[PDB]
Amino acid sequence: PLVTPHTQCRLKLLKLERIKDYLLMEEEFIRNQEQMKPLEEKQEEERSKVDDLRGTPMSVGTLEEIIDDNHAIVSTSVGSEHYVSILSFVDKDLLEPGCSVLLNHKVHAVIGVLMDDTDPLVTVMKVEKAPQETYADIGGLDNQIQEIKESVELPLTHPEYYEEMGIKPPKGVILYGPPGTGKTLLAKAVANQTSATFLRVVGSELIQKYLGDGPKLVRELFRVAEEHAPSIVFIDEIDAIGTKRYDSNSGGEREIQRTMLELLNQLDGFDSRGDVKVIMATNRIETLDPALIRPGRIDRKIEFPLPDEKTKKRIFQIHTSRMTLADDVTLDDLIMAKDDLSGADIKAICTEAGLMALRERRMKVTNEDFKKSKENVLYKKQEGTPEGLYL
Amino acid sequence: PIRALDEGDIALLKTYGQSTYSRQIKQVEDDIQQLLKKINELTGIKESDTGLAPPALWDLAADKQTLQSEQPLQVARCTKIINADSEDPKYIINVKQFAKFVVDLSDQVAPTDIEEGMRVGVDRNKYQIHIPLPPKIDPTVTMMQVEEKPDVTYSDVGGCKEQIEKLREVVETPLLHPERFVNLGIEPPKGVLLFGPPGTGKTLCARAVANRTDACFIRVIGSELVQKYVGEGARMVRELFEMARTKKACLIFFDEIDAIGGARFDDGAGGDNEVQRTMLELINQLDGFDPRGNIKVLMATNRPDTLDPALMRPGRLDRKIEFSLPDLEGRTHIFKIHARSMSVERDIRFELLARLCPNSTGAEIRSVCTEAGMFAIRARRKIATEKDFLEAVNKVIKSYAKFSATPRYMTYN
Amino acid sequence: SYDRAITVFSPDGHLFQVEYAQEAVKKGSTAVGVRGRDIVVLGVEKKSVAKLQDERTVRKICALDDNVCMAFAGLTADARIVINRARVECQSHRLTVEDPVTVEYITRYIASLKQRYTQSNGRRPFGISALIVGFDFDGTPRLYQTDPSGTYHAWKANAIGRGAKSVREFLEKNYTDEAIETDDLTIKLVIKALLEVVQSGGKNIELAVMRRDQSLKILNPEEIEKYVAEIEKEKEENE
Amino acid sequence: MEEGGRDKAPVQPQQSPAAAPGGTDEKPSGKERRDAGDKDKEQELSEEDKQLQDELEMLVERLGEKDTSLYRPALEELRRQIRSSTTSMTSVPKPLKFLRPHYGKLKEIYENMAPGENKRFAADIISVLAMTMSGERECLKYRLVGSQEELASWGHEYVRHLAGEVAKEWQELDDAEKVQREPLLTLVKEIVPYNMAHNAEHEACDLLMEIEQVDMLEKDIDENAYAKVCLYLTSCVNYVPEPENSALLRCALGVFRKFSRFPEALRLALMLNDMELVEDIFTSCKDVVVQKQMAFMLGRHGVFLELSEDVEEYEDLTEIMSNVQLNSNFLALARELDIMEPKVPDDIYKTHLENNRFGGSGSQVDSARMNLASSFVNGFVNAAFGQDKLLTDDGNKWLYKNKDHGMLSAAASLGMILLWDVDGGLTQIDKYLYSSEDYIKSGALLACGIVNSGVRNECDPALALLSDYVLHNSNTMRLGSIFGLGLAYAGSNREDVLTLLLPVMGDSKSSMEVAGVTALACGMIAVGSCNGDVTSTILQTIMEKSETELKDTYARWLPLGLGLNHLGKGEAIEAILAALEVVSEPFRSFANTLVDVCAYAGSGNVLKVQQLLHICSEHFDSKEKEEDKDKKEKKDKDKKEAPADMGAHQGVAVLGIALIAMGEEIGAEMALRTFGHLLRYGEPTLRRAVPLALALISVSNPRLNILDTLSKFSHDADPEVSYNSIFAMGMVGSGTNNARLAAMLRQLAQYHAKDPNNLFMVRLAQGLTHLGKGTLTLCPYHSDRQLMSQVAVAGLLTVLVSFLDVRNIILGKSHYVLYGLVAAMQPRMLVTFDEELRPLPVSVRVGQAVDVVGQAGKPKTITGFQTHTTPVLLAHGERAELATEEFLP
Amino acid sequence: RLEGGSGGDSEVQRTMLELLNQLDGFEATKNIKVIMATNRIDILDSALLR
Ligand SMILES: Nc1ncnc2c1ncn2[C@@H]1O[C@H](COP(=O)(O)OP(=O)(O)OP(=O)(O)O)[C@@H](O)[C@H]1O
Ligand SMILES: Nc1ncnc2c1ncn2[C@@H]1O[C@H](COP(=O)(O)OP(=O)(O)OP(=O)(O)O)[C@@H](O)[C@H]1O
Numbered sequence A: 001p002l003v004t005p006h007t008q009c010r011l012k013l014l015k016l017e018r019i020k021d022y023l024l025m026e027e028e029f030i031r032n033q034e035q036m037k038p039l040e041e042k043q044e045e046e047r048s049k050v051d052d053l054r055g056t057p058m059s060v061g062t063l064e065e066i067i068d069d070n071h072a073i074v075s076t077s078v079g080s081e082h083y084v085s086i087l088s089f090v091d092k093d094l095l096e097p098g099c100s101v102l103l104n105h106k107v108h109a110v111i112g113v114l115m116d117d118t119d120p121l122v123t124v125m126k127v128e129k130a131p132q133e134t135y136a137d138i139g140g141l142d143n144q145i146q147e148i149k150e151s152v153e154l155p156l157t158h159p160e161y162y163e164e165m166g167i168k169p170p171k172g173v174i175l176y177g178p179p180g181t182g183k184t185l186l187a188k189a190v191a192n193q194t195s196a197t198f199l200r201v202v203g204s205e206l207i208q209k210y211l212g213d214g215p216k217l218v219r220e221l222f223r224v225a226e227e228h229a230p231s232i233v234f235i236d237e238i239d240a241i242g243t244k245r246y247d248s249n250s251g252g253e254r255e256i257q258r259t260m261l262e263l264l265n266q267l268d269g270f271d272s273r274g275d276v277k278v279i280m281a282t283n284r285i286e287t288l289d290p291a292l293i294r295p296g297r298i299d300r301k302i303e304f305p306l307p308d309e310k311t312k313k314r315i316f317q318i319h320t321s322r323m324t325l326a327d328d329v330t331l332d333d334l335i336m337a338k339d340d341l342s343g344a345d346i347k348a349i350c351t352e353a354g355l356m357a358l359r360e361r362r363m364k365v366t367n368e369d370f371k372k373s374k375e376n377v378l379y380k381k382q383e384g385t386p387e388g389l390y391l
Numbered sequence B: 001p002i003r004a005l006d007e008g009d010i011a012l013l014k015t016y017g018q019s020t021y022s023r024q025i026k027q028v029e030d031d032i033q034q035l036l037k038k039i040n041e042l043t044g045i046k047e048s049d050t051g052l053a054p055p056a057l058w059d060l061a062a063d064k065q066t067l068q069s070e071q072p073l074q075v076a077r078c079t080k081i082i083n084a085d086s087e088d089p090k091y092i093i094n095v096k097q098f099a100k101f102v103v104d105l106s107d108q109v110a111p112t113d114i115e116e117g118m119r120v121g122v123d124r125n126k127y128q129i130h131i132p133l134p135p136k137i138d139p140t141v142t143m144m145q146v147e148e149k150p151d152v153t154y155s156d157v158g159g160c161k162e163q164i165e166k167l168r169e170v171v172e173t174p175l176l177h178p179e180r181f182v183n184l185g186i187e188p189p190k191g192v193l194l195f196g197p198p199g200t201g202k203t204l205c206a207r208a209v210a211n212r213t214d215a216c217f218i219r220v221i222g223s224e225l226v227q228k229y230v231g232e233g234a235r236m237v238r239e240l241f242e243m244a245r246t247k248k249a250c251l252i253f254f255d256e257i258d259a260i261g262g263a264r265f266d267d268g269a270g271g272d273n274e275v276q277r278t279m280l281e282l283i284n285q286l287d288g289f290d291p292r293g294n295i296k297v298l299m300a301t302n303r304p305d306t307l308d309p310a311l312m313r314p315g316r317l318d319r320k321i322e323f324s325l326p327d328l329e330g331r332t333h334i335f336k337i338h339a340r341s342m343s344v345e346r347d348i349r350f351e352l353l354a355r356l357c358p359n360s361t362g363a364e365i366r367s368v369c370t371e372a373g374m375f376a377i378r379a380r381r382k383i384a385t386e387k388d389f390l391e392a393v394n395k396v397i398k399s400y401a402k403f404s405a406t407p408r409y410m411t412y413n
Numbered sequence C: 001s002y003d004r005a006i007t008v009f010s011p012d013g014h015l016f017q018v019e020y021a022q023e024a025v026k027k028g029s030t031a032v033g034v035r036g037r038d039i040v041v042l043g044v045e046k047k048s049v050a051k052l053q054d055e056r057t058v059r060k061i062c063a064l065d066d067n068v069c070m071a072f073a074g075l076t077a078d079a080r081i082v083i084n085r086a087r088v089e090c091q092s093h094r095l096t097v098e099d100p101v102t103v104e105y106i107t108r109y110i111a112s113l114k115q116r117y118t119q120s121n122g123r124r125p126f127g128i129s130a131l132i133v134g135f136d137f138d139g140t141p142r143l144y145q146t147d148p149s150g151t152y153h154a155w156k157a158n159a160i161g162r163g164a165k166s167v168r169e170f171l172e173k174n175y176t177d178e179a180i181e182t183d184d185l186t187i188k189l190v191i192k193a194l195l196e197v198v199q200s201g202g203k204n205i206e207l208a209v210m211r212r213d214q215s216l217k218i219l220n221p222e223e224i225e226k227y228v229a230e231i232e233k234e235k236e237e238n239e
Numbered sequence D: 001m002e003e004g005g006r007d008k009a010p011v012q013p014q015q016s017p018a019a020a021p022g023g024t025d026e027k028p029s030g031k032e033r034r035d036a037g038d039k040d041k042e043q044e045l046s047e048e049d050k051q052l053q054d055e056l057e058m059l060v061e062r063l064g065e066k067d068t069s070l071y072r073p074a075l076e077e078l079r080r081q082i083r084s085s086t087t088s089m090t091s092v093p094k095p096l097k098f099l100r101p102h103y104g105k106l107k108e109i110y111e112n113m114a115p116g117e118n119k120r121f122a123a124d125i126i127s128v129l130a131m132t133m134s135g136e137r138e139c140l141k142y143r144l145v146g147s148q149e150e151l152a153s154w155g156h157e158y159v160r161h162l163a164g165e166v167a168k169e170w171q172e173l174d175d176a177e178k179v180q181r182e183p184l185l186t187l188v189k190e191i192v193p194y195n196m197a198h199n200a201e202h203e204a205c206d207l208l209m210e211i212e213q214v215d216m217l218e219k220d221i222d223e224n225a226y227a228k229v230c231l232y233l234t235s236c237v238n239y240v241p242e243p244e245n246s247a248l249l250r251c252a253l254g255v256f257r258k259f260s261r262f263p264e265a266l267r268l269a270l271m272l273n274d275m276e277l278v279e280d281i282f283t284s285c286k287d288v289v290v291q292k293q294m295a296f297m298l299g300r301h302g303v304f305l306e307l308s309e310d311v312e313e314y315e316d317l318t319e320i321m322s323n324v325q326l327n328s329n330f331l332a333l334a335r336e337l338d339i340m341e342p343k344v345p346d347d348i349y350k351t352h353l354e355n356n357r358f359g360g361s362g363s364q365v366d367s368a369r370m371n372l373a374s375s376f377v378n379g380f381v382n383a384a385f386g387q388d389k390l391l392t393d394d395g396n397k398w399l400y401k402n403k404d405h406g407m408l409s410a411a412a413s414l415g416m417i418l419l420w421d422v423d424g425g426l427t428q429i430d431k432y433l434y435s436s437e438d439y440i441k442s443g444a445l446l447a448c449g450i451v452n453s454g455v456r457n458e459c460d461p462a463l464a465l466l467s468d469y470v471l472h473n474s475n476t477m478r479l480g481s482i483f484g485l486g487l488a489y490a491g492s493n494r495e496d497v498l499t500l501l502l503p504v505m506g507d508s509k510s511s512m513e514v515a516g517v518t519a520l521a522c523g524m525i526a527v528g529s530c531n532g533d534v535t536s537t538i539l540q541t542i543m544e545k546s547e548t549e550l551k552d553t554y555a556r557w558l559p560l561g562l563g564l565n566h567l568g569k570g571e572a573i574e575a576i577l578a579a580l581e582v583v584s585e586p587f588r589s590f591a592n593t594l595v596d597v598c599a600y601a602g603s604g605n606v607l608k609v610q611q612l613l614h615i616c617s618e619h620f621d622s623k624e625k626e627e628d629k630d631k632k633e634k635k636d637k638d639k640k641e642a643p644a645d646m647g648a649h650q651g652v653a654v655l656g657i658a659l660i661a662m663g664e665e666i667g668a669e670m671a672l673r674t675f676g677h678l679l680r681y682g683e684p685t686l687r688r689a690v691p692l693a694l695a696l697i698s699v700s701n702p703r704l705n706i707l708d709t710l711s712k713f714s715h716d717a718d719p720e721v722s723y724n725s726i727f728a729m730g731m732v733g734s735g736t737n738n739a740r741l742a743a744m745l746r747q748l749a750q751y752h753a754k755d756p757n758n759l760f761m762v763r764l765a766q767g768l769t770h771l772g773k774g775t776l777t778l779c780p781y782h783s784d785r786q787l788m789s790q791v792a793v794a795g796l797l798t799v800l801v802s803f804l805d806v807r808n809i810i811l812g813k814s815h816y817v818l819y820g821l822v823a824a825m826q827p828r829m830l831v832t833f834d835e836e837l838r839p840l841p842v843s844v845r846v847g848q849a850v851d852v853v854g855q856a857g858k859p860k861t862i863t864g865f866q867t868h869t870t871p872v873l874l875a876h877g878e879r880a881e882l883a884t885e886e887f888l889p
Numbered sequence E: 001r002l003e004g005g006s007g008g009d010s011e012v013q014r015t016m017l018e019l020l021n022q023l024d025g026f027e028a029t030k031n032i033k034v035i036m037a038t039n040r041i042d043i044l045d046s047a048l049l050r
């Protein structure tokens, strides 16, 4: 992530060709690795007959009980239960009733044991790519940047400060405020610069219709996060997962309400927790369940207000990084004159003014682009409130 | 009158300004992302190796014995027996998934141990009984017998000198002195509900009695009772209330019984039907015919208003212990619990801190104790001062509890 | 939850409908005021003329008696009743007792009239806050303030309106214990205080002073422009 | 689509150049005046860079391309003015008249005759007219000429001054970030004759500006971070005179032309050392120019400052040599007893207290080889004045109890207790010296070289350790005497005691470990000349190693001093020297990869890195040259630690996947010493990737291979929270991971991270990036261990006292004459700023704020404020001079 | 987004939050463009109008 000239300079032509040099050599070295292997023994006769000892259509079974005389009991998908033997090379130390095993068809015998057993709905929610830029991308939020770093990055990088006072770091963080402020960016910048793994949850993702399929996916969600790295979980749009827990008249409302009541249990209920951090985000905060807002579950409440006349300059500066800017413009024209508008408004102004230059056959962008752009973006919010009663 | 695109004017744009390094820098970034892919499929080293033992011990088995245990060994199934008839086998056997057969015993059996309701090994071809089995134990109650001590002493539940006193009477005292109840002529209650505001200490009292129990203690995961199949959740209730009768005096802790049934209604003709069958099965094995004897039930909830009056009846839930907020003497004891194990100044007072938390819980007090040390890491200190806690009270409570009353305060001094 | 009544209490002892009246004060234009050695001064901001009206009917600074002033915030309707009522009391006091009216006596009348106006149901309280400035009580300069709850109170430098928290924090680091003599210096303190306006256009400041012996002296936008020039003269020492 | 009606320019410049063949002949006025009316108007419709779409430039050539093909060549009688009207008007649209094979024909309109002063109609326009087109000429057209035919025709002759005025025009029009476009122009034009381009561009830059030097100045050194061998040879010496001739910032000479010492010429920086002795200005820049010249990148400068001004201007030499060294001892004496230091912590051993209740009882460990590691509770913590009377009684008993190699080891630990000392360091040894034993005196007198290491004053050039050496008829008296003095005089390149210790090589007394460390002792001294050392080593190498096919005591020690005597030059003559000198059998051609890449410390020479892979890649090699593929991988570890993190991410990407993944003996035995050589800072990417292969011990191999990778997994200094890994692996490492073999090792790894609170700079990067070695002192250890049997006997000479080039620690002191100032410094996560808007904010981590002797840390360019100007070198270096000036109200 | 209680609707919002997020979630999509057309400008929600 070092393309730091950020412009059409020969350095970025030199830097990226270095990256081309190392990856081509990494290709050619592993190309030589599968080339110059004169070693053949296959399996020195042991695993080769074993791979022929097991059946070729390997099937999947489920343990019920363990009769340890090398002759146990299993269960199929339909529930057909078979007094099968153990056909060796399996240590009887990691097989428990519930752990799924590997079976045959002709004799149904236990050949291996199936590992990791993840239902392929939670593996979709496992992020592999760092999407966007680092903390230097966003346009100045540094009082609240230092807040989220105290609970996520700093306890993982340097947990020597906390043992000197015996204080565990906070676990839950709410991001709340008006829309268009930077909630989704602050999660993506953390997921960029991190060392542990990352999990994203899009709102109504853990909602199904089979009346028990809802809460069952939540158990496997925290199970995967606990079994893997000391990592964090980002669950966004939790306004569709909690509203004050009232009792009413609809029957599909309860399997909604029950799944959202056992997330409470997995979070800060019994046993312990492990090193799992949870980051949650909404637009509205007052319509939530007060059982989730209490500390023990969430220890940080972070406001994201609409910007000022000072850090707004940093918003216009970053979104006008790589565009040909004519020297006629003043950034403080649109900032000081109008004092209402979000950070997502400013990105729309910079894109619209660039469209106005091609609209009148230009490359550079003058003040007259921003005069028409600041109009056209802002005409989507109504005229006003009250008349001059107050003075 | 605004139109500014024509195919000739397209060729104006992509030649003006850095014609030298435009594609020269771009396709270098393009084919390296292609090369990010072409490394990955060239590696291909996924390697989901499992099942295999260390390859230095099974060598004796997979020489001939594995081939000796293919054709002579049997793929026999297990079943259940209804009954038998005299002078003959005449064995009537079901599967509950397959059909019901009437079969013969084999030669390798003793005809005495073919008692009714017994799991037996059954042939696949002629379906003869070969091997009788030990009875089935339920697999998921074994998963939720705790077999583990969570470490919370009664000295950490401060502010609750009387709620523990009520809870000591029901759980601990008949299990250690079952004399004074009989020697006066009373009976102890058998069901205690816990209700009140959240974060008040519901889980702590349940976590602390799992420490000092000297008895069978069963945590019950609440949403395991709700299943996909019809009647499956009601069968899970039964296996729980059978094995409790086997051993003596086992403890069962439910938690958030708001989820497993709160109200019985039917106006739109449907809804939470399967939840009601599991919930009413819980009732009839709680009171009814065959009283349970020595089974103590603890429940805890945050929303006690929305529960069924069938559970509100004493005889099922007998003692209503509620948790409130500690007045002042409770909170001053709570600060001394959660801040004794941290590097503080040895001269500060805590009663001034308990003033400034008027309507607060035990969770909110601990959040102040954790936050005050976080201000010490904002600066460069290793001990907490008085103003560290005073800023932490404004950070936790006053940042969310009041914003109009603090600046415009001049109605009260 | 429970407010919707001026007679009910909260479970933690509050009157939210009284507290909501102070929220209506924060929609008003800011007005500041200090006292000095002899000359008291108060200024208002946010004139914002709209190209088609006469500006002598939008006045926010009035005089109750010959030696007491008034500046307010909130909404314009409720201020007109309080101003017109206070002119009667500061005149009927002179009839019953032949003295002139002190600046302390008229603020207790405004607070007590707003007091009983809060107690009875079906009486919406006044959503205004006022500044009473008068060097009347035997050559002594004073300034008080009010509150929609009905609590008269004395400061030495005051700010109200939309943005009072910045100005009141500004004056604490600016009001010297050195008394601002050479009273154009004290007037330049207010123009420096009102320089932190919501937009600071320069020509939206209406400062009104009183030399404690004459009547009210409304400043013109040529003398006030001279004081805005010398504020930029002292600002040249930053480089 | 509102076309039509206002298409004036697609009609009349569509007709009048179409009437130009209709009015060239038989119309002498219409040939000229309509051309001039075409020329100025097409010139005028391009000068505003606010209409890129030109109503002529992509409207006329639809017929005008076929016109110009019949107007410019086919006229054949071109006048003196009509060529200045044709070529001035028709060389403008030719980048867009023609497609991508324009690159051979930017001349068939232009270079018929370049009309006059082509910037006359191209001055105020940035690049739309011809300046992009000028770069198109220098890209392809000049390079094919200047590939072998630089000295050539008009394509070079006028093109020189044509590129001269264009390079002036980049810093003329707007003076924007197109300043850096001039090195984009100067290096593409005549890539190898860059200096022939730069010599005109040096003098043009000297008269260009004195404020717009510095961002182009750092643009050069960013391009000089990696190049070809000849480009790094060329543009670094072009970099030198710009703060010498244009400006006189000039305090960036000494270290930032140590950049240019080894590549261009060793005497050239000595002529720049002469240029140091020219600009003797005042004292303050002179002071900190010569602060680095002793113990920051090299020593050996104490012979050139005893000339005719020996009062104070040349009496800084001994002050540089040992007094500011002793003022640095006054840091560890005064300032570091003040911050966090009593004489004996001695309690990282005591931090193993909670283990005795973890699982019942304790007191089960009674291994005698743990008592080797018991010396490092006293040994490592007592660096920088951890002086101990009777706290060495754990040493004093175990010295007189058993363990002859530990008698040498505990005696060698006394030199680490008194490090950087000359005042009373020998007096501490003398009371613990006279025991009349072989092992006791050979460890103590080797430690005497450690005490005066970095001093190089008159302590014992041949006094003590030469008299220790001539005592030999026997064991380590023969060995341990030559090692300490070459360790002490490693910073020097003195010839005399090298010739005193050359008959150690010429004795042919066949003690093998003595001759091996003899190559290591002479290797630490010199890096340049004295080819007779290369002669002396290979004579005994051909005598001894030819009559054997055996252990790496031959191989790990004897070619290594050859590589240390020829370290750091990418000339590739040293490979022609060494590899053709030892043309031999392949077990002696193990040494082929040593002196090849020891001259290749750090640069971008990726063509070497592929021959560092492709020759001996895998081959599966049934136990014959497996040492060579490890040592070929050993030389992959360097040429990776200096490219300032550009290849470090690529190094951890390759060596994580390729070897430890799809390897064998190369990966699972040796390939973790990269991480024990790449960085010593620590970060949880590689710090957690090593216990992926360590918690999985993979015990089927001789597991001390993987437990060697345990050992220098803790080869990251600057103490951390890594105690969680080592103590928990020490808990499983007591019973399992047998305490007979590595109970020394895990606690060697445990006790080395908290060596001392401070003094962790062992990582070969000073100022920003220059080497300053540590290489000649470190690299023997990672060459020493990649096997076994030196965990018991022979490597105990090495494993204690191998690397001893720790150069202090932080950048807090002020030294303003009386040394009373402390100032206000502001420490931050390091710079990222390369080219952005004007005043580029230097850093980003504003939270930390100290005043005085605060730590260095991994990426810290610590700045200062409060208008103290800090006008010393403006590049840091931990002995700032800090004058005072405040003329800005 | 209306209130809770037995009013408004949850499930209409449950679908709406996914439309609110598959084009503006953690993963930004490319080369997919949406067109929305309706009257009643002031009564659609102020989270997809941003
Ligand atoms: N402080 C900021 N600096 C720079 N860019 C910003 C900032 N705030 C918002 N943006 C812009 O807003 C977009 C991100 O939207 P944001 O993270 O505000 O969504 P959100 O808060 O999740 O909105 P919603 O709550 O409606 O889903 C980015 O494209 C970014 O360019
Ligand atoms: N009376 C108390 N004394 C000391 N600590 C307390 C007390 N009450 C609560 N706490 C602290 O608050 C934390 C959270 O309390 P807990 O979650 O047990 O409350 P709860 O009533 O069980 O919450 P819920 O009703 O949501 O289940 C506990 O970890 C405990 O440390």
Ligand SMILES: [Mg+2]
Residues within 6 Å of the ligand: A183, A184
């Ligand atoms: Mg969002």
Ligand SMILES: [Mg+2]
Residues within 6 Å of the ligand: A269, B202, B203, B204
């Ligand atoms: Mg609880």
